[PDB]
Symmetry: D2
Subunit: 248 residues, 4 copies
């Protein structure tokens, strides 16, 4: 409504927008005036995204580990909406195991889906942003990228790698008005964390000074803040939203 | 006037609100609905703050190194507005010198004004915030607190100390719904930076990937973000707003 | 000679030990009493390593992106020397380019050689170290992993990912007396940096407060320190050796 | 007696060397060939230090919050030994309390003893080091300076401030061959930690992945490493020795 934190005129691509954090992000960006394209791995997922976004955007199937899919999706977005102004890299997976039990495929799937995809998508949207001298790339990371976590050495490596990538990209494109940042959630209430048993939830909560889980809307708010015109002077930064679980 | 980033019902105390970053902070917090009390070291300064805030708040004279002044100001605020919900510690000074030329008084003035004042004011507002299980303390730091800077070892020590204090306070009060954070500006255009000669401005700008100075409004935006209900899960954090001058 | 920083009785595997930092590491570990196996990609390289190590170890050809090679090398080491007590992950490559010019293979080669290899080798040596309740894994990183660098987003991502991996592994194996750490060199004098022209060397040196390049022996000293019994209480740490280029 | 980590020819001043970490530091520096002057607040303390150092140094009474004491001690050192080549700032105190119970004097004593004393002593030794283009200043910090700790906001602020001061000083003096660093111990076994009850020790140990307290000798080793010729390319750094309690 006001000129504050106003994304009217911006086209936002949010990967993994079916539920939880990704859905919260897509919804808030739309609320702040962005035209939003949210993605899912399946066509039915894409249609559910189209359904909740309505006139403020649409859902598309995207395979974030596949070049042709990325090419097809960006072409469709450029044609209907104009080029992507805001990229939110939210799609990620876990393949947890202690290192002695971690399979080669569990390592590689994480590298592919959680790190390499960020290279590929970021590169694919950057040309347009640099031509316009205006852009936002926001990665959805994790506290685990900074703190480490036993049983998630793969996930941690990928998330930490994304921050290395982010800082380097930030340096490359800052003078052309593109910012590149990471939002790092702590323990956030999703269907996945609701699947944990009571002892696991208590143990995890014991490490959160705030004494609760984060809401997906809280991660969305941080992403919407960095996406805004007002955040033009923030780049190469990692915004920690973890209820005090880790303090840098 | 939406429910997004809405500070209606909050009382904000912003120290050093006469100009630059402090004035931008006070103005934006008022724009987002906060009742704002901005402070200056003199009554005439206070009146100029009253003048720009109008119906959305008022100016008061505060000596941040003096307990009696703090007591008097908070009593007057509590009486008219209710207790402080948001404290923005913005008042600071510089006493620059290389260490071999740094005087005892230049060290001690900085410790007093830039560090000890934060202990005192934070302690004075915390009791009310904890009773309400709601509060925000936001320190205006500097990139120098994290990077260090030749010729500002005193300023750097105070800013870095505020972060240590912030993380410890955050741990103490997180479970009672009070967040404590720092915003760390880089090189921001103020009357002071406009006083620098061309060679100094160029040398400084050469270290900023964004290739410009920050605006006081950009610092205000980050403070307003952390002050918001939406930032409830961010505590013990340092939000860097430096155009890529330093990346953590 | 003395009991201080004494590696007698330890078997050290140092990848990429033909020249520069890797050779310096292998030589110093041998000087401090370790039995050292250094690796190269070629048999002639391996023989050169055998030649400089003499009675204090031997050189082996290792392809750090190939499982069978790793398996063969560790079997040979275990047979002759006993199991690896100290792993130094030093072998790395660069594939520099600005992101808009970075090829898929330049990204993937870096992920393979600079990140995935560390997963594979670390996992392959960990079982023996954990059985003994004694071990050291030391990664040779780079300041670029923490700072970022334009034109090296791939290298930065890998190095940063190694630190995420390191912290997670540290958490997993700390209680069993294995430490996992990274040494992060700045600008070090090697044949590669000697290949740079005068303007590039000057520009790079301008960002080093120390006003010189680091020596490979300085990186070796830091690695030897973390490898020592005396460094048993350091884990999940990144030791920066960069002449003040970046300060964390 | 090798050329490795050899401090022969260096004069080291170690403040608070009566017991624990300070005594371990003084003893190891002497073992590595340094002429060591260890300090205590009393003459009897000084004599006990003289007693353990024997021919390798001596004890002196120093009041670290008093300029005249500092002047007298450095004059006596310069006269007998030559100017200080290595300063280890180890003397510190605690004045623990939750912020709502923290007295003005408990804040100010900590600032004086744990922060301002570091400014004063560092400044007093720097001139000689810079003239020689050789020097080491090593601060004994704490994990609390980086992590924060409830009930130690004053201690945390001082330790964090020392790091800010350290980075700034490092930038000022790096090109003249003086390094300035911090060693940050975690939970170390001292008489003080042995005074804690079982529940406190268990709760603290639960946050240490290594599953034990650190030894004072482990802190000494890290200080000796940074004091060495081999650590000439490490400046503005914080070396964490905390058994994985915090990972940066």
């Amino acid at each position: 409504m006001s000129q504050f934190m106003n994304l009217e005129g911006k086209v936002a691509l949010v990967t993994g927008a079916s539920r939880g954090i990704g859905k919260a992000i897509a919804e808030l960006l739309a609320e702040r005036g962005a035209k939003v394209i949210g993605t899912a791995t399946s066509e039915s997922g894409a249609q559910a995204i189209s359904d909740y976004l309505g006139d403020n955007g649409k859902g598309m199937a995207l395979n974030v580990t596949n070049p042709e899919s990325i090419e097809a999706v960006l072409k469709a977005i450029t044609d209907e909406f104009g080029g992507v102004d805001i990229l939110v890299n939210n799609a990620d997976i876990t393949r947890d195991n202690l290192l002695m039990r971690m399979k080669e495929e569990e390592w590689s799937d994480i590298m592919e889906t959680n790190l390499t995809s960020i290279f590929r998508l970021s590169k694919a949207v950057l040309r347009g942003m640099m031509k316009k001298r205006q852009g936002r790339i926001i990665n959805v990371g994790s506290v685990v990228g900074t703190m480490g976590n036993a049983g998630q050495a793969n996930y941690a490596a990928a998330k930490a790698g994304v921050i290395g990538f982010t800082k380097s990209m930030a340096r490359e494109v800052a003078s052309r008005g593109v910012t590149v940042n990471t939002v790092a959630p702590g323990f956030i209430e999703t269907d996945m964390t609701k699947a944990l048993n009571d002892e696991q939830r208590t143990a995890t909560l014991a490490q959160v000074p705030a004494g609760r889980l984060g809401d997906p809307r809280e991660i969305a708010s941080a992403v919407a803040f960095l996406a805004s015109p007002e955040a033009a002077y923030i780049t190469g930064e990692t915004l920690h939203v973890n209820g005090g679980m880790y303090m840098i």
